[PDB]
């Protein structure tokens, strides 16, 4: 519950319904239940799972960094008090995107990560879990940031040396976690060399092993490349 | 302008 | 509650902190518990709860349209059965976005309406009561759908006549109400000869008091005039 | 494409 009387196909193709009609909210919710099922997620089930909680926190860190940025403008000198209703509402909205993270978090070790044994799995979910330690540490101001982001340096760490040893250097997910781990260094690890490094040396790998892939694997590998490049060509 | 994540 | 507890002035803050965030759930519910609090709404307090419900309604609209236009074609000859997923997922959509007119058609009655007595509120919250009513009749299909539709009809029939005798043929709002009752006859009512003929008449009764007008007045009138113009290059 | 409502 609220999932556990629907049918596992039958929460999977209304997650499929909730992204055609753009209802995150409503995706989350119904891949939540999936999971709780029981068994292994597939491929294309691991892709709706992501793609919902992505965009629900997504849409949740947006409105959170609007927040925040009206609350350090309300700090400066010269500013009017205009009382607790900022640092208020930022918390509100900072309360449930925690919220959201914990329930992902809670997902991936109850029990994604453990039964999953072939490394595109495996990395998927340590990258998710990276990812979700990631947001919290956006908003961690506290005793346990320092921890918040061990948590999301560990995880990340793990899927990275999976996908090194397990996965071709073009591979979607492969590139993918690269990206965002670089970007950890950049933004939360204060490690902006680290994250060039990161960016460029997964460009150039996977530049170099696309000779090997269809016209198809091409477009998908070329994608997420040309992310890398974009943060490469914004950080130097 | 903001950086990329995926 | 469960806005009782915060204070009036901290909701107003908060819905236009919310706005800012695009978070229109959480505008709509700090206006919710706004009105409650008994007090009239002033003009910008109005357009904030008109804001705050129009894009929470118009994101459940809009993802009603894409189920029901997959329920349509699944109910097409040739093809091939889903079983129940597709009605009951536009059903949950279709329940939650009733909710949410029915909420604001309770603001409405208790106590917008009877308290409004300046045309500029009483008009206002009139074409809210036509634009609710009009959303439950989009998705209406049952034995209650004629009196729907004659709710909606009634409410913006009343604030058509009040605009008409105390409004200036260009003020927003008397230009809003009569965008959206055109849209009315057009869409819901099967009237389009009736929608054509007013958007029309309201056009160019504006156009002819436009010399009346400010540089900022011009301005606000002549982009809900555009709207009418919109209609009707796209029905004509 | 969509008629304007306001
Ligand atoms: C379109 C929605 C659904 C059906 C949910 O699929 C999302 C997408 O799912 C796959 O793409 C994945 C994928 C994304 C691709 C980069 C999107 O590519 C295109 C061309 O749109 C972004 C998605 O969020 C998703 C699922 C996520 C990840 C990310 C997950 O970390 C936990 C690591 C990188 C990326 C991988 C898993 C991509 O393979 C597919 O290969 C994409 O198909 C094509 C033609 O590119 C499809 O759009
Ligand atoms: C910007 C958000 C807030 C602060 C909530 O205000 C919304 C807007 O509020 C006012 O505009 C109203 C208004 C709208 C204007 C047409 C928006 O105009 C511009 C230039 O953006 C659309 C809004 O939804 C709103 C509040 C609604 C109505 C509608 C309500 O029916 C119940 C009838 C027509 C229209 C009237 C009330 C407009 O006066 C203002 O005159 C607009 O200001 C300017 C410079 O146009 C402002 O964007
Ligand atoms: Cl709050
Ligand atoms: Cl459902
Ligand atoms: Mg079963
Ligand atoms: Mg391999
Ligand atoms: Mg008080
Ligand atoms: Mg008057």
């Not at chain 1, 899927?159 to 040893?165: L, Q, R, T, Y």
């Not at chain 1, 970007?183 to 997964?202: D, G, M, Q, R």
Request: aromatic residues 8%; charged residues 30%.
């Amino acid at each position: 519950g609220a999932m556990g009387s629907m049918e596992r196909a039958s929460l999977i193709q209304k997650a499929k319904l909730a992204e055609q009609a753009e209802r995150y909210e409503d995706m989350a919710a119904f891949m939540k239940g999936a999971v709780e099922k029981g068994e292994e997620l597939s491929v294309e089930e691991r892709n709706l799972l992501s793609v919902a909680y992505k965009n629900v926190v997504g849409g949740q860190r947006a409105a959170w960094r609007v927040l925040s940025s009206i609350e350090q403008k309300s700090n400066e000198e010269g500013s009017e008090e205009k009382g607790p209703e900022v640092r208020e509402y930022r918390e509100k909205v900072e309360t449930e995107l925690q919220g959201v993270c914990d329930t992902v978090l809670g997902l991936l070790d109850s029990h994604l990560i453990k039964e999953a044994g072939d490394a595109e799995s495996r990395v998927f979910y340590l990258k998710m879990k990276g990812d979700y330690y990631r947001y919290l540490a956006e908003v961690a101001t506290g005793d346990d940031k320092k921890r918040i982001i061990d948590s999301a340096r560990s995880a990340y760490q793990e899927a990275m040396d999976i996908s090194k040893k397990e996965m071709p250097p073009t591979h979607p997910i492969r590139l993918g976690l690269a990206l965002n781990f670089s970007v950890f260094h950049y933004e939360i690890a204060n490690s902006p060399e680290e994250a060039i490094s990161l960016a460029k040396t997964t460009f150039d790998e996977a530049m170099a092993d696309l000779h090997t892939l269809s016209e198809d694997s091409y477009k998908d590998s070329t994608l997420i490349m040309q992310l890398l490049r974009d943060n490469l060509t914004l950080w130097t | 302008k903001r950086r990329k994540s995926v």
